[PDB]
Amino acid sequence: SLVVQEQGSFQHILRLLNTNVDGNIKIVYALTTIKGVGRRYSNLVCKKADVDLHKRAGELTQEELERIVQIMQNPTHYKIPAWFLNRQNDITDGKDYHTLANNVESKLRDDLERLKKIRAHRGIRHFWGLRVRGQHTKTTGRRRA
């Protein structure tokens, strides 16, 4: 272990999935800004991409980033087990997906609107803004808006 000097090509931000990621944070924890990229999705993707995890996010070469992103978008192709993803057995498709960046919120608006048009109890509560997971509302969550 020793200190090594580096070149001045460092880039202090970088655009992935239409979001800007800081370059002064270790690589694994830097990607977490991307919605969908949680703590244990960065750890696994960054080691399937075979990057030195000890370096900063701005220390990566151009090819490595696109190497990482390509894995992130089709995780199953690189043998990321199904149980690592945030969407499985999609209600309309039967397939598996991992949702990133803007897809996370857009899919979310689609999830509620499904229950709303069906007019199920869950969808009703969301449209009313209340708690939907069986909590008591008598004493809790008063100044939520």
């Binding site: 272990s1 020793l2 200190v3 000097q5 580096e6 900063r56 220390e59």
Partner: protein
């Protein structure tokens, strides 16, 4: 500072031998390298023989000037 340019690497080696007592924190207020980079700085300067250890510990590193 997270990573170091030449203008800083030489800066370390030229000022650190004057410190009466050095540690992970002392190298972070006299010069502005991060907490992580101070630790590798300490171990490198130990191998290179510029600073002595009084004791070594996971949470509190104590060094002094070489004699």
């Amino acid at each position: 500072a997270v990573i170091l340019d030449q203008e800083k690497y030489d800066r370390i080696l030229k000022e650190v031998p004057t410190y009466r007592y050095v540690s992970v924190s002392v190298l972070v207020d006299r010069l502005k390298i991060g907490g992580s980079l101070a630790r590798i700085a300490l171990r490198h300067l130990e191998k290179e023989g510029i600073i002595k250890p009084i004791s070594k510990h996971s949470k509190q590193a104590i060094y002094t000037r070489a004699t």
